[PDB]
Amino acid sequence: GWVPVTKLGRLVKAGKISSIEEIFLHSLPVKEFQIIDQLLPNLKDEVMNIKPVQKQTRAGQRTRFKAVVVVGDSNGHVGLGIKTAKEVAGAIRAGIIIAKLSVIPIRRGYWGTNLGQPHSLATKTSGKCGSVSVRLIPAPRGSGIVASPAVKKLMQLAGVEDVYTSSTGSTRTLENTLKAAFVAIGNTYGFLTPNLWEVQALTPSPMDVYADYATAS
C-alpha cells in the first residue's frame, strides 16, 4: 500500500523527480514518509538509545520510551528522528519515519586541496542545542572520525570519513548532543564559500513544472 496525500507525493509516484537533490534545491516540504524511501533506497538506519521517560499520576507512573534514531547512507544525507511512544518497537518505527522525513544534505568538502572525493566538511561549523555545542572541524584524509560514540555514528551515517569534533556542554544527554550535531550538519549548507559567489539560475520548482500530474483528479 502506497496512496499519496500532498502534491509532491503524487509527483514522486508518477516518477518525474529522479533524486532528492532537486527537492533540496527548492527546499520542499516532505511531510509524507514514503517519498524518501522511494528516492533513497540506500537508507542505513540506526537506533541510538531508548531511555524510559516518566510522567507522574495519582497512582503509579507513565513509562514512555524516547528513542533516538539516525538515518543515513554514505552519500551525505542524514536523518534524525526522536520519538516518544509507549510501545518500544513502535516508537522506534515512528522515530525511523521521522528521521526519513527529516533527512538533510551535507556539503562534504576538502581537508586541504581537492585530490579525490570529499569525505570531510567544508568549514569549521557548529551547532548548539539546549546547552550542547558540537563543533565540527575538517580533519585531513585518513585521520578518521574523532568524535564521541553518538556523534561518530552520525558521521558514519553521513558518509564523512574525516572529522574533528569539539563537543562541549553536557554531552551526556545523548539526545541533545545528537540534535546539536544535526544542526551543525544542516549549517554546512549555509556558509557561503567563494565557491558560491557564482550566480545561479533559480529553476522553476517541480511544483510549478509538472503541475498537471500533481493534485487529485
Binding site: 586541504g112 586541496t113 585530490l115 579525490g116 585531513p140 584524509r141 585518513g142 585521520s143 560514540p149
Partner: protein, 182 residues
C-alpha cells in the same frame, strides 16, 4: 655513564579500552593475518600514525617550497620501497589516507601466504618462526618483517632446513634411525 641508550615505547594503546566495534575490527584483522597479540595491530597503527603526522606537518607548509618537497618526497620513496604505498599514488595526499590493512598486507607474515609456500597465514607464521624462509640468503624469523618489494622476488625456502632440501628433519631423522635397526 658512556651515554644513555635511547629507547622508544613505540607501540601504543587506544585512548579507550572497549568500544565493541573497534575491538571486533581489530580481532577480524588479527584473524586475517594471524597476529599473536593486539600489540601487532597497534604497532602497525602507531607506525602509520607517525607517517601520517609527518605528512600532516608537510602539508600545512606550502608545497613548491623546500622541506615539504624534499622530506615529503623522501617519505613517499620510503613508502614505495616498503611496498605499502602503490606506484599509482605519489602525491602525499594519498599517503595521508592509507590503512593498517595496507601495512599488514606487506609483512613477511603474509608475503609467505601470497607467494604460496605454506598456505594459511598461521602456517606461514609457524614456518617463519622455525627458520624456514629466508628473504635473501639471510634467514628471517620476524613475522612483522615488512618486505621491501624489490627483495620480495627472493622469498624462497631456506638453504638449510627441510621443505627446501637439506636434511630429513630431526623427527624424520629419528624415524629413519628407528627403521635402520629392522
Amino acid at each position: 655513564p658512556r651515554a644513555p641508550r635511547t629507547y622508544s615505547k613505540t607501540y601504543s594503546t587506544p585512548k579507550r579500552p572497549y568500544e565493541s566495534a573497534r575491538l571486533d575490527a581489530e580481532l577480524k584483522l588479527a584473524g586475517e593475518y594471524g597476529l599473536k597479540n593486539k600489540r601487532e595491530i597497534y604497532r602497525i597503527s602507531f607506525q602509520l600514525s607517525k607517517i601520517r603526522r609527518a605528512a600532516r606537518d608537510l602539508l600545512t607548509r606550502d608545497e613548491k617550497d623546500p622541506k615539504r618537497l624534499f622530506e615529503g618526497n623522501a617519505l613517499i620513496r620510503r613508502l614505495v620501497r616498503i611496498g605499502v604505498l602503490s606506484e599509482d599514488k605519489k602525491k602525499l595526499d594519498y599517503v595521508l589516507a592509507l590503512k593498517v590493512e595496507d601495512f599488514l598486507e606487506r609483512r613477511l607474515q603474509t608475503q609467505v601466504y601470497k607467494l604460496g609456500l605454506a598456505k594459511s597465514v598461521h602456517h606461514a607464521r609457524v614456518l617463519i618462526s622455525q627458520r624456514h624462509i629466508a628473504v635473501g640468503k639471510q634467514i628471517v624469523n620476524i613475522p612483522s618483517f615488512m618486505v621491501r618489494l624489490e627483495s620480495e622476488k627472493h622469498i624462497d625456502f631456506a638453504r638449510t632446513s627441510p621443505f627446501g632440501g637439506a636434511r630429513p628433519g630431526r623427527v624424520a631423522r629419528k624415524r629413519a634411525a628407528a627403521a635402520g635397526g629392522e
